[PDB]
Amino acid sequence: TNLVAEPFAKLEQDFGGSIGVYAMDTGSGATVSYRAEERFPLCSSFKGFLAAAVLARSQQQAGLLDTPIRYGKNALVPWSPISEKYLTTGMTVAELSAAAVQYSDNAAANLLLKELGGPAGLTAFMRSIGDTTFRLDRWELELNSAIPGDARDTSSPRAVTESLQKLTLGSALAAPQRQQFVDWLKGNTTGNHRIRAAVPADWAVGDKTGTCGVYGTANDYAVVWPTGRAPIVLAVYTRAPNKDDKHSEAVIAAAARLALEGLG
């Protein structure tokens, strides 16, 4: 019997799909795990890890983050509001990274993927930090298909949380780069109704959302700084069996609340 899990099971059943949750209290090592090792599509949530990989590269390449990239219209993709805005002026690597993280900008994400050697290059970066679960296989927008049983472009809530911890709190990035990653996540604009909706208003939150949309597939991961407490790192992912099943932000927020409540 798993009593801790029961509210998560009820929540996913009402949702009509599966919810995956992993939360870590970095002070005590306490966790809350529900389907934590199952795979879920990354959707736009990969863009946080993409930005981290760019930051890692920027450690050894002087002025990389400050480098202007002058892309053309052929680089644009639907839902690239920042990239379109700066088409006539260009954007720095840092600005593209921030756009990918904070506005889920698709053109920015593809541009940065190209610099890293594509989906395989991002995957190699994740392997280099000890994440053997993460895989990115395709580019925007094809990576969002979220087909049940398809492992392409997936990770697990546990691996997402473990990697997020390494990159934001651990030693996977040098300190100045770690802090930049945190600053970008904290400035995310797309997550107000997800993990952020579950946390007390006074707590700092950095997050990245994903919304494949199809197959009820959406997610959010976050690092949370509780007033007067060690940070919490958590990941909440959803999916559902049928193509036109709707995702739910409310379900993500509700799962995040239960995770915070269940943590030592």
The domain of 46 spans 1-264
**Beta strand 31-34 pairing with 18-25:** antiparallel
- The DSSP-derived string for 192-240 is TTTGGGGS-TTSEEEEEEEE--GGG-EEEEEEEE-TTS--EEEEEEEE-
Please state the domain count of the chain: 1
Catalytic residue among 44, 45, 58, 97: 44
The method of structure determination was X-ray
Please say whether the dihedral angle defined by the alpha carbons of residues 247, 35, 140 and 252, taken in this order, is positive or negative: positive
How many Cβ atoms from other residues are within 10 Å of residue 81's Cβ? 14
Sole residue written with tokens 């398809």: 150
What torsion do the CA atoms of 102, 105, 111, 114 make, to the nearest 10 degrees?
Answer: 80
Annotated resolution, angstroms: 1.2
| CATH code, 231 | 3.40.710.10
Distance (Å, rounded) from C-alpha 179 to C-alpha 117? 24
Distance (Å, rounded) from C-alpha 149 to C-alpha 71? 36
58 part of the active site? no
Distance (Å, rounded) from C-alpha 29 to C-alpha 27? 6
142 part of the active site? yes
Catalytic residue among 6, 37, 142, 261: 142
